[PDB]
Design a protein around this ligand. Structure first.
Ligand SMILES: CCCCOc1cncc(-c2nnc3c(C)nc4ccc(CN5CCOCC5)cc4n23)c1
Ligand SMILES: [Mg+2]
Ligand SMILES: [Zn+2]
Length: 339
């Protein structure tokens, strides 16, 4: 109750008041205290003019933002702070890359709202685990594929359909249908398997050049931008990349532990006895992260610095790899850990 009251009655604080570099690619949104993030969401929506443009009801918007925050659990990585940082990067793309030259206003709004909702109710486990553990989610969606992503979308729609939380309530039937369809496309694009399936079409688009009159190019660009937001922790400094690795592997190893208890053999990356982090992170950066930001650079010249910072963080991992081998004796002057 109290949180809602202040969010609604204190006024939407100016975006620059959050941080002086808030609109910069150098800013790390994970440094913002979690208690300040809901107001930051409002401040960003205001600064992008979405509240005014779509005449979003402020009481409704405040309830929506809090309910979305409440719909994330607390696994090490896939929590509200992930969603906030992803949404923040969407804002950064709006501020720095002139998205208004490529996408419709409603598409940009949909991207931002999708970022907020894209990992709703994540349980710290991937799609394979849902099928293997015969979860309720796999019962619902395994035959369609993208189990978790369909669940994230359905949670987002359930929030909208909660009384007092439909921020699109006044939209026309056409614009409402448009928004929900965009959210579906964008949230489902956060599945790695989807990204892999469209990756050649993304390269084709970047080769022939973006045609803003081509409806397929809008769709493809939206998928690329969404994945860029989802992986945006890799575009910051080394320390952020190091911390997120810690969170990512804590989550993965928990799943791997669960899988061993069910009698299944986990992936190397989820097996704490077998996983070599530097090599795995290098691989993720080279095969997944870097190509996404290279395509981004190919489409937006001003995105160059993002690819550059990811490539540098990739080299930082190679530089620090030797630190994973124990030289000399450990701090305690003992070799007891061998027994
Ligand atoms: C292309 C956008 C993908 C968005 O979805 C996810 C889902 N799960 C994990 C990630 C993710 N975010 N950061 C990382 C890092 C730092 N390392 C990552 C390393 C591997 C994988 C690939 N997956 C394989 C299947 O099991 C889960 C991890 C994802 C990783 N990842 C992204
Ligand atoms: Mg996801
Ligand atoms: Zn995510």
């Amino acid at each position: 109750d109290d949180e809602y009251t202040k969010l609604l009655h204190d006024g939407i604080q100016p975006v620059a008041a959050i941080d002086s570099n808030f609109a910069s690619f150098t800013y790390t949104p994970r440094s913002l205290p979690e208690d300040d993030t809901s107001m930051a969401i409002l401040s960003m929506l205001q600064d992008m003019n979405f509240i005014n443009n779509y005449k979003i009801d402020c009481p409704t918007l405040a309830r929506f933002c809090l309910m979305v925050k409440k719909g994330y659990r607390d696994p090490p990585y896939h929590n509200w702070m992930h969603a906030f940082s992803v949404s923040h990067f969407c804002y950064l793309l709006y501020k720095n890359l002139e998205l208004t030259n490529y996408l419709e206003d409603i598409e940009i709004f949909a991207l931002f709202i999708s970022c907020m909702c894209h990992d709703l109710d994540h349980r710290g486990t991937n799609n394979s685990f849902q099928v293997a553990s015969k979860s309720v989610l796999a019962a619902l969606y395994s035959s369609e594929g993208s189990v978790m992503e369909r669940h994230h979308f359905a949670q987002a729609i359930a929030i909208l359909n909660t009384h007092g939380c439909n921020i699109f309530d006044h939209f026309s039937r056409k614009d409402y249908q448009r928004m929900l369809d965009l959210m579906r496309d964008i949230i489902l694009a956060t599945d790695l398997a989807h990204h892999l399936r469209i990756f050649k079409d993304l390269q084709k688009m970047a080769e022939v050049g973006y045609d803003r009159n081509n409806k397929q190019h809008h769709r493809l660009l939206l998928c690329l931008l969404m994945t860029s937001c989802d992986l945006s922790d890799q575009t910051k400094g080394w320390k952020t990349t190091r911390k997120i690795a810690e969170l990512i592997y804590k989550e993965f190893f928990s799943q791997g532990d669960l899988e061993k208890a069910m009698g299944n053999r986990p992936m190397e990356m989820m097996d704490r006895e077998k996983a070599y982090i530097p090599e795995l992170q290098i691989s993720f950066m080279e095969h997944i992260a870097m190509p996404i930001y290279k395509l981004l650079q190919d489409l937006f010249p001003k995105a160059a610095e993002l690819y550059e910072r990811v490539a540098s963080n990739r080299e930082h991992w190679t530089k620090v790899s030797h630190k994973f081998t124990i030289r000399g004796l450990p701090s305690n002057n003992s070799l007891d850990f061998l027994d």
